[PDB]
């Protein structure tokens with residue numbers, strides 16, 4: 207698939223929706239981003255950074271009216287330059303739950319509460335994208 211890639215989420219997200227993204231991190235990658243959007247707002251931005259001051263960190267945030275909020279940072283970093291990955295995002299009633307390569311990574315509490323209006327997922331950054339899909343579990 208071509209990156210950046212837009213995956214419509216018809217009728218928005220709902221609990222029990224599972225989104226699966228398969229790809230490969232480019233060699234010498236700098237960044238990856240998943241952006242769950244509600245119009246121009248970003249309900250959930252998931253942003254692995256491969257070199258922020260010589261550290262690897264995952265940054266999560268929300269953008270409302272063109273302003274970023276308080277960052278939530280995770281130092282557990284399961285991505286590896288040059289290697290294949292699987293990201294699974296499970297929507298639960300009170301948070302997005304993220305697993306990478308079948309291991310739980312983080313949860314992100316819903317800040318945007320109109321889940322039905324979060325109707326697009328953008329995928330960008332330094333990856334080759336193989337598949338992006340959803341199902342109900």
Ligand SMILES: OC[C@H]1O[C@@H](S[C@@H]2O[C@H](CO)[C@H](O)[C@H](n3cc(-c4ccc(F)cc4)nn3)[C@H]2O)[C@H](O)[C@@H](n2cc(-c3ccc(F)cc3)nn2)[C@H]1O
Nearest residue numbers: 237238239251253265266267274275276277279330331332
């Ligand atoms: O909050 C998320 C946003 O962060 C900003 S950078 C943000 O800038 C601030 C000053 O305005 C602070 O400097 C902020 N900070 C917070 C801390 C910090 C330090 C210590 C702590 F303990 C906690 C936080 N140390 N920097 C720093 O993260 C990115 O620009 C923005 N972004 C990324 C992308 C993107 C596009 C395409 C991609 F493929 C991938 C990503 N498109 N927009 C998005 O990620």
Ligand SMILES: [Cl-]
Nearest residue numbers: 317318319320
């Ligand atoms: Cl809302």
